[PDB]
């Protein structure tokens, strides 16, 4: 029945975003709730944000 087949390969870059699932290696899971601006994030005495 099949005369010819054309296979298309699409590439996609997916960004991390609210709803995405993240975990550690101690079975500690989570869903990302919000992406905070750098300014807002807790920072060290040295000024480096978490």
């Amino acid at each position: 029945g099949v005369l010819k087949i054309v296979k298309v390969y699409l590439a996609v870059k997916r960004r991390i975003q609210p709803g995405d699932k993240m975990a550690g290696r101690h079975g500690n899971k989570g869903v990302i709730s919000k992406i905070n601006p750098i300014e807002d994030m807790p920072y060290d005495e040295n000024g480096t944000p978490v």
């Binding site: 870059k13 960004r15 750098i38 300014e39 005495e45 040295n46 480096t48």
Partner: protein, 230 residues
């Protein structure tokens, strides 16, 4: 109101990237008020120049590999994000980079345009393995502010789709790190009087001094709206 204004005192420039700025005298509580307000504008609102579009000849997409080049196109683009650029006059400049032969392709191989200044000429972009290999590309640098990802830019204008242009991230924001310390300025009478020490760490482009001036300008522009309209 016995109003007590601060003035810019000392500018330690440890490096072109890192610069400490002491500020006094500040009245009690204005240390943190100005400290954080400025930190937030300096991180989110700072204007700068950054690579927006790159077009390499013989390259249709960013996932291909060019022969005679160790790095895949993605890795080359990530290096061009780190390329430190100053545009003096124009908002948008297209620089040309043509290089051949065996060697680490540096930022100096870009044709020095008159108004444009490359802050880090030794910045690595590409490693050429085979001597016969030549790379040629046209790097567009635009001026903007904050962070403009290619994904946020692939969902806005897109009036023309020229199969051959690659969109990469360009952190306009010159400011990499900022922290402010409130130290006591044991003032002539007042011991509650304090100094503000702002430790800034930028990449190239913006001058620390100039950036603080701009950030204070933006905050004062926003206050005109509240002082004026009731």
């Amino acid at each position: 109101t016995e109003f007590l204004k601060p003035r810019l005192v000392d500018i330690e420039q440890v490096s072109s990237t890192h610069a400490k700025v002491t500020l006094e005298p500040l009245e009690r509580g204005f240390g943190h008020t100005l400290g954080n307000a400025l930190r937030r504008i300096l991180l989110s609102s700072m204007p700068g120049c950054a690579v927006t579009e790159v077009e390499i000849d013989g390259v249709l997409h960013e996932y291909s590999t060019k022969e005679g080049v160790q790095e895949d196109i993605l890795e080359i683009l990530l290096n061009l994000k780190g390329l430190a650029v100053r545009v003096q006059g124009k908002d948008e400049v297209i620089l040309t980079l043509n290089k051949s032969g065996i060697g680490p392709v540096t930022a100096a191989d870009i044709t020095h345009d008159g108004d444009v200044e490359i802050v880090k000429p030794q910045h690595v972009i590409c490693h050429l393995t085979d001597e016969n290999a030549s790379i040629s590309m046209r790097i567009k640098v635009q001026r903007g502010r904050g962070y403009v990802p290619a994904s946020t830019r692939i969902h806005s204008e897109e009036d023309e789709r020229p199969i051959g242009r690659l969109l990469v991230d360009a952190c306009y924001s010159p400011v990499e790190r900022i922290a402010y310390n409130v130290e006591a300025a044991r003032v002539e009478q007042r011991t509650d009087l304090d100094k503000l020490v702002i430790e800034m760490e930028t990449n190239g482009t913006i001058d620390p001094e100039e950036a603080i001036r701009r950030a204070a300008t933006i905050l004062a522009e926003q206050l005109e709206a509240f002082v004026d309209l009731r």
